[model samples]
Target: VNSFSGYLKLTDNVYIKNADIVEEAKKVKPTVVVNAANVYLKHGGGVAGALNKATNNAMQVESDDYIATNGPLKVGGSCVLSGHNLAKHCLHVVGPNVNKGEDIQLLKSAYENFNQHEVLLAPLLSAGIFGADPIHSLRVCVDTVRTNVYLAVFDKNLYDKLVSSFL
Candidate 1:
């Protein structure tokens, strides 16, 4: 039988520069990145600025699968939008932005689901969302990632290996 182990590690904080968002992302060395630069932004220019401008506290999720995201929509949508906010997910545990009531509710909804399952939590800004408040975003992420069921981390190389199996 194969045994498994898991742990959640919070990060020191990622500093993204310039509204030159593309350049800033390159610095993170993320293997994959999604561009959420198109959604109707709520704050200043994009997701990052909007997160800064908003005041609502954020909610986080935990589990085996990594649920990384930003400014998710009000609760009650589908799993589709989960990835809409970031990279394609095993599942995206969408979270609140600007600390609004709806955002909070949606995040809670996301958290409840992941807490019971295994999920991966990815860094939002790394996925091309520069508007989400970093500290708040990270805090929510840390808390959830800490208590979840615990799953294996998905590395691009491993993912590639699996995906290539059929070929």
Candidate 2:
């Protein structure tokens, strides 16, 4: 269980980092990173955009076959993108589109699925371009990682939000 080495405790292993997540990926070389994607598997913007940029947009290229065969990923559903410049694997989760509604439950399910992995570096789930309330999104992420043996990586806004939850 090489991936389970960091699982010394289960009292919430979520970590918030202020540095660039892409750079962080280079260091941690995590088992899985996130792609906040659309149904079309396009890594258009936000964290997905950054991750796509980091990998030279190859993530989207590799995702085409998955999307074509499996169809558009609904909110809460995910597909795997592996052998990339970031993590060894990329878990592409479809987040809620504000135009459709908050769909907090969808975010919850996405986080729950993400927790299934041993180590995960994810951006703010539904909190960026999706326009989800930062607090609520962080709560769902935190709640899922609480009982599960997961390690989550976050950037400044998400880190700050996670900190506020403790206060």
Candidate 3:
């Protein structure tokens, strides 16, 4: 599923694909690569884990250092890290976990509070372990908007659903 499975355009500024977003980030070297991280910024699993593995785990070490200095990031908050391995910066964004009663506002904030990076490479944040509604999550992502953005969907079925729903 990590393989580049072709691409589709959602709008003039938005594009979606089925591929390893970390690898795509490497290809484009976007201004920032958004990591759908945890409140702890542990880079433990989900898209965070993928980015960590891509960066040779440098993401985890830097994330730990950031947390040590500033404490755990609040839900919807972001911690920026230096990494050409992914992009100019890796924005570790903590989205809401509906399973924990976190509302869509927090999830929206996770996208809204993203750093000032021109080109963004992002996954379908919060749609997985965070348990957000996929269509809603995709809407928020598109609404957040950027001059150039790529939304990477990792799962085959979800990818088709999204395409059928939006494309």
Candidate 4:
């Protein structure tokens, strides 16, 4: 049997990567997969876009509950939303906007809000379309975690940047 548990190892003992998020989630059987979404759960692009599309926009339905309770989600705050197919639950994280540079704490809050799990899939929050440098983004995120966190890299240049950042 091919085991997916041994796919990626971490740097500074926290961050690691997989070729694909959904496929890896299937193998790892995540307790939860973090969704990088806006307060509105629009999923316009980046991690949110992929997940929104993957789950058939179930995030919107889930976002309604939070809206009812607390008005749109606040950056740096999070909620656990349910999902089908890849994961049992989706941890909806309201990340900083593209212009919210170097506010690494916002990303940290999202990670801190999630419940403990043996394995979790999280995207590079506030990085990419959100404008934080991948190096600093990984630094802030990995520095805050004490458990396993899985990331995905679809672009060759980005994959190189992540690996080279540590080396």
Question: In terms of lDDT, which candidate is strongest?
Answer: 3
Worst 10 residues of 2 by lDDT: 1-10
> Which scores better on lDDT, 2 or 3?
3
Q: Tell me the TM-score of each prediction against the true structure.
A: 0.31, 0.81, 0.87, 0.82
lDDT of 1 by residue, 90-143 (tens): 232334443333344344344444444333333332222333444343344445
| Ranked candidates, highest lDDT first | 3, 2, 4, 1
lDDT of 4 by residue, 90-122 (tens): 887776765755355677776665435555677
Residue 98's lDDT within candidate 4 is 58
Most accurate candidate by TM-score: 3
What is the alpha-carbon RMSD of candidate 3 to the true structure?
Answer: 3.6
Q: Can you tell me which runs of candidate 3 are displaced by over 4 Å?
A: 1-6
In lDDT terms, how accurate is model 4?
Answer: 0.68
Locate the minimum summed-lDDT window of 10 residues in model 1.
57-66
Q: For candidate 3, lDDT tens digit of each residue in 1-167?
A: 12223568788766798777877888877777888888888777788888899988888888788778989988888877876487888777788888788877877778875535656778876888889888888888778765566788888788889989983
What range of 10 consecutive residues in model 4 has the weakest lDDT sum?
Answer: 1-10
Task: Go through the candidates in order and give the clash count of each.
Answer: 17, 0, 0, 0
**Candidate 3 overall lDDT versus native:** 0.78
Could you give candidate 2's per-residue lDDT for residues 92-152 as a string of tens digits? 8887877667477788787776766766766767766878877777667777754332334
Write the number of the candidate with greater lDDT, choosing between 2 and 4: 2
